[PDB]
Write an enzyme that holds these catalytic residues in place. Structure first.
Site, mmCIF file in Angstrom:
data_model
loop_
_atom_site.group_PDB
_atom_site.id
_atom_site.type_symbol
_atom_site.label_atom_id
_atom_site.label_comp_id
_atom_site.label_asym_id
_atom_site.label_seq_id
_atom_site.Cartn_x
_atom_site.Cartn_y
_atom_site.Cartn_z
ATOM 1 N N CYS A 160 -12.788 2.951 -67.919
ATOM 2 C CA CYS A 160 -14.110 3.006 -67.294
ATOM 3 C C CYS A 160 -14.633 4.428 -67.079
ATOM 4 O O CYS A 160 -14.929 5.143 -68.030
ATOM 5 C CB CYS A 160 -14.072 2.186 -65.991
ATOM 6 N N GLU A 202 -11.242 -4.252 -67.275
ATOM 7 C CA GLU A 202 -10.704 -3.679 -66.045
ATOM 8 C C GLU A 202 -10.943 -4.645 -64.907
ATOM 9 O O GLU A 202 -11.985 -5.278 -64.863
ATOM 10 C CB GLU A 202 -11.402 -2.360 -65.722
ATOM 11 N N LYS A 209 -5.469 5.134 -63.984
ATOM 12 C CA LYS A 209 -6.833 5.673 -63.936
ATOM 13 C C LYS A 209 -6.961 6.942 -63.093
ATOM 14 O O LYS A 209 -6.582 6.965 -61.932
ATOM 15 C CB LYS A 209 -7.794 4.617 -63.406
#
Ligand SMILES: *[C@@H]1O[C@H](CO)[C@@H](O[C@@H]2O[C@H](CO)[C@@H](O)[C@H](O)[C@H]2NC(C)=O)[C@H](O)[C@H]1NC(C)=O
Ligand SMILES: *[C@@H]1O[C@H](CO)[C@@H](O)[C@H](O)[C@H]1NC(C)=O
Ligand SMILES: *[C@@H]1O[C@H](CO)[C@@H](O)[C@H](O)[C@H]1NC(C)=O
Ligand SMILES: *[C@@H]1O[C@H](CO)[C@@H](O)[C@H](O)[C@H]1NC(C)=O
Ligand SMILES: *[C@H]1O[C@H](CO)[C@@H](O)[C@H](O)[C@H]1NC(C)=O
Length: 461
Positions: free
Chosen positions: A189, A60, A156
């Site tokens: 993440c 990322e 995300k």
């Protein structure tokens, strides 16, 4: 043309960060930077393909870094379409050079590539959610097949605090893509800690493998990257490809390739500044334990000790209930509200100046994320002072002969963690039973830092 196995790659990337300025750069300058990172990632992709890889995940923020506000980021963004547009950026043929380059690397090396870049979505003023500055900016995973075709685009969902330069999608994006080597899902993440999309992908779409770009700040005892990512894999019973950023300076390190039964490869390095390529053959439809009832065992038995000398300890801003581990062997039980944690153990030998404790937590976490936890953990106390039980601790000396941990969890979503001194995983040195016991298979190959059952009650968030 289906395949029973495939070779996975993940790359831990030492990112080249943009120079800082007080004013947004030009698109020509921003590309310059991204290309320097891309030059490196190309190295990893070429090598990995030359090693049989079928897919490779990169981290990322790996292409432009993490220091941004909405405006300084803008010149790095591209408008990234729905894969359904049915498009090969390498072939066609400008205003999306990053996507073109990624598509070409995937095609020229005949390999799936997974990367994190930024998407811009200019919105209309009629849209009430449209930001004042005219656009959404999303943190975006993209996947390209071995033809170079864009096959996946995930925005995300759960931003970390500090990601002020991004927006939150109005609705959770459940993104999959299928291959000759299995069905894959994807998220990024901090998503791993939430229900949408991470859990749904597995529970409701039955993905075989997860690809997982990340830039993860390691927080002991329970959230080192490798420690937690592999436990999630095991708990959800999926292959898991974690590509992390390499930045020791910010406690970012810990990439790997994890299968339901064990880690297959991992890297943790806090001492150098070079990145790392990992590889391992995996099963397309991976072999896993049948469904685990996590409360079954722990609810069938009475407490393994009583008249306990209990005390409070702070583990990552949460107030656990602890009990010191006195013997070189023993059985203890410890409760907090609805959770009872049961530990049987036996150490290889007593290291005189190292205390261990068994701890229980049943409650809502709130610092830097609001989410409900239930945790049983055995851990090494930073110091012999029991007020430090739960505090971050790098190293230990006490090997264990056996352990068996279980709890009365009110969730079916629990993740078995085990971590050894110097942040080393313990591949195949333990396993989980059908009734929720996490138990050693042999003496540990190194000193133990923790053995934890990390539960998660998504509804009580
Ligand atoms: C390949 O993946 C597709 C997703 O593109 C799978 O189709 C989904 O299957 C799940 C679980 O059975 C369903 O609930 C979904 O409705 C399907 N897709 C979508 C977009 O909703 C498909 O099962 C996979 N291929 C296989 C098993 O051969
Ligand atoms: C990749 O493939 C394209 C296909 O036209 C080729 O022309 C280009 O030179 C290649 N670039 C790299 C970096 O391999
Ligand atoms: C797990 O086991 C307990 C008994 O120990 C039972 O009451 C509970 O319903 C079980 N859960 C599942 C999902 O089978
Ligand atoms: C508890 O530990 C003792 C040794 O300390 C062992 O002999 C006993 O069988 C254990 N009981 C359990 C695990 O229920
Ligand atoms: C940033 O980039 C320029 C070239 O674009 C380089 O010469 C310079 O040394 C860099 N700035 C800093 C502060 O390192």
């Amino acid at each position: 043309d289906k395949q029973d196995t495939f070779i996975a790659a993940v790359y831990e990337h030492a990112a080249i960060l943009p120079n800082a300025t007080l004013t947004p750069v030009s698109r020509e300058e921003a590309l310059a930077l991204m290309n320097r990172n891309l030059d490196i990632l190309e190295g990893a992709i070429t090598s990995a393909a030359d090693q049989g890889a079928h897919i490779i995940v990169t981290p990322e923020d790996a292409i432009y870094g993490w220091n941004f506000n909405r405006d300084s980021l803008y010149p790095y963004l591209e408008d990234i379409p729905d894969p359904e547009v049915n498009w090969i950026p390498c072939n066609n043929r400008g205003q999306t050079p990053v996507q073109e380059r990624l598509s070409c690397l995937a095609k020229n090396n005949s390999i799936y590539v997974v990367a994190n870049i930024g998407d811009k979505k200019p919105c209309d003023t009629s849209d009430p959610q449209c930001p004042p500055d005219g656009r959404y900016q999303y943190n975006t995973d993209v996947v390209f097949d071995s033809q170079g075709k864009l096959v996946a685009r995930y925005h995300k969902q759960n931003l970390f605090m500090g990601e002020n330069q991004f927006n939150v999608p109005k609705e959770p994006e459940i993104v999959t893509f299928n291959t000759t080597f299995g069905s894959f899902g994807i998220f990024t993440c901090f998503d791993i800690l939430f229900h949408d999309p991470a859990v749904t992908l597995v529970k409701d779409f039955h993905v075989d493998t997860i690809v997982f770009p990340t830039a993860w700040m390691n927080v002991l005892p329970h959230l080192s990257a490798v420690e937690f990512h592999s436990a999630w894999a095991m708990g959800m019973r999926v292959n898991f490809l974690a590509s992390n950023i390499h930045y020791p300076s910010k406690k970012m390190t810990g990439s790997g390739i994890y299968a339901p039964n064990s880690s297959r490869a991992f890297h943790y390095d806090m001492k150098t500044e070079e990145g790392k390529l990992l590889l391992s053959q995996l099963d397309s439809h991976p072999s896993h334990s049948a469904v685990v009832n996590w409360t079954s065992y722990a609810s069938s038995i009475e407490a393994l000790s009583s008249g306990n000398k209990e005390f409070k300890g702070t583990v990552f801003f949460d107030e656990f209930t602890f009990v010191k581990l006195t013997g070189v062997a023993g059985n203890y039980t410890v409760c907090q509200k609805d959770l009872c944690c049961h530990l049987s153990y036996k150490m290889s030998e007593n290291i005189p100046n190292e205390v261990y404790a068994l701890g229980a937590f049943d409650g809502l976490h709130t610092v830097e994320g609001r989410y409900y936890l239930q945790i049983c953990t055995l851990l090494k106390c930073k110091t012999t002072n029991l007020n430090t039980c739960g505090d971050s601790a790098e190293t230990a000396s006490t090997r264990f002969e056996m352990f068996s941990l279980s709890g009365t969890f009110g969730t079916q979503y629990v993740f078995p963690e085990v971590l050894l001194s110097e942040n080393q995983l313990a591949p195949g040195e333990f396993q989980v039973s059908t009734d929720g016991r996490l138990f050693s298979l042999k003496p540990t190959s190194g000193p133990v830092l923790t053995v934890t059952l990390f539960g998660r009650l998504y509804e009580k968030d």
